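$ run holo --ligand "magnesium ion" --emit tokens
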Amino acid sequence: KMDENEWSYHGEGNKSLVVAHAQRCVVLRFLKFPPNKKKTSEEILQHLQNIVDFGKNVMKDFLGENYVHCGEVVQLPLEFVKQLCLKIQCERPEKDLDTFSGYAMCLPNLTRLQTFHFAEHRPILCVEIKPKCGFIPFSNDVTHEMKHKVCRYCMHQHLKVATGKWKKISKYCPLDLYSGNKQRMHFALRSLLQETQNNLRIFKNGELIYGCPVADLKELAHHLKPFFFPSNGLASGPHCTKAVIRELVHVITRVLLSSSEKARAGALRLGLQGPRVCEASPGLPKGCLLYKTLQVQMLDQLDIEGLYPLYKRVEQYLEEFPEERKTLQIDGPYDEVFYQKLLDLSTEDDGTVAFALTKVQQYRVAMTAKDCSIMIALSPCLQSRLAFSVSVLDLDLKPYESIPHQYKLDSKIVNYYSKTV
Ligand SMILES: O=P(O)(O)O[C@@H]1[C@@H](OP(=O)(O)O)[C@H](OP(=O)(O)O)[C@H](O)[C@H](OP(=O)(O)O)[C@H]1OP(=O)(O)O
Ligand SMILES: Nc1ncnc2c1ncn2[C@@H]1O[C@H](COP(=O)(O)OP(=O)(O)OP(=O)(O)O)[C@@H](O)[C@H]1O
Ligand SMILES: [Mg+2]
Ligand SMILES: [Mg+2]
Ligand SMILES: [Zn+2]
Ligand SMILES: [Zn+2]
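-- output --
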């Protein structure tokens, strides 16, 4: 028996909606789809099963077993889904919700959990960061001038601000964060606090308390003092907002730079081609999650510019041989062989379709890693004496048909930014 009153609205990115249970530390993830065309009921089941099979097989090998969690696909009563949707409709921010299938993913609620223990903890603080792409493209295939010296995030800011999506430009550059420089990382996190956008959220015990009275720097610092300056009897005591936010920013930097005891044979060893600094504003440990995420982003070896020629070869082949879309395993299954196909890092274009297809798939995987989120969970545990857990969220492979749009959008981002100067 599923009561609709127990589940609350948790969040919503443009492709899926999440709801969280108040009692158990789990969440349910429902898909969004366009009116043209809404997917069939048995196709939804396979889509969700591919998201699990991608995270299970591909991303656990690239990032680590401890850092990825992708719970099972589950079936629910339609009457529960209809009623839960209507309640939650109210709380949406404003692509139609999956109301007719009754299929969803049951994931653990990482806002209330530690990974290494894996029970609920309280009091528990959680910082969810969306870091974006951590390098500037370096291939000779790129035409435009600005792309070699400014990262896509900073270039995308200006368009988003002018569009009206955001009010002001952020001072956050991903390359400050991904560079192992503590000083740059600290600055990157402070700017990201000052202008959150969709790139930062903070929770206390499951409840959102920061990045969408908005509100608010002082009010945040109230919730953080018990974690960072714990009064063990004595309240000594008077800590200003500046000092509280500082201890947050240090701890998050210290956490992202931490790695497990393991420093295993790197799945990816791709070197960092500069610029390591960005013209928008002023190494990283091999074991840590932030580095491993950067490496899977670097499967975009040739830029989008770039890869669109390689995409065109695979499309003219499937124009003429449409039956081979399935036989080539373009839409999975994302199994142990599929992970092996991604490890060919060679960049010569003599082999023509076998090579292009391999690179198209590597690019789909990179686009996933650029758009992924990182969750950090601070809390006391028996196994300040704060214990941490790192995790990655939002790991669903970007669809094959979005590659045209990715070219089209990047062309618009740089041309507006170059016109602006
Ligand atoms: O359009 P882009 O390249 O800026 O990236 C999209 C994001 O834009 P933003 O973070 O606002 O700059 C976009 O963010 P918002 O929906 O605007 O929060 C999504 O993360 C989207 O991912 P998905 O394809 O829905 O999984 C992202 O789409 P993909 O490009 O990853 O397909
Ligand atoms: N396992 C989880 N634990 C805690 N919070 C979660 C979990 N899964 C999802 N969320 C929250 O739900 C939000 C929205 O879900 P999600 O990002 O997965 O959907 P999306 O449409 O694919 O997003 P995006 O547009 O960023 O690609 C996330 O930003 C995250 O804060
Ligand atoms: Mg998505
Ligand atoms: Mg997300
Ligand atoms: Zn930048
Ligand atoms: Zn514990």
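-- notes --
The longest helix spans residues 41-63.
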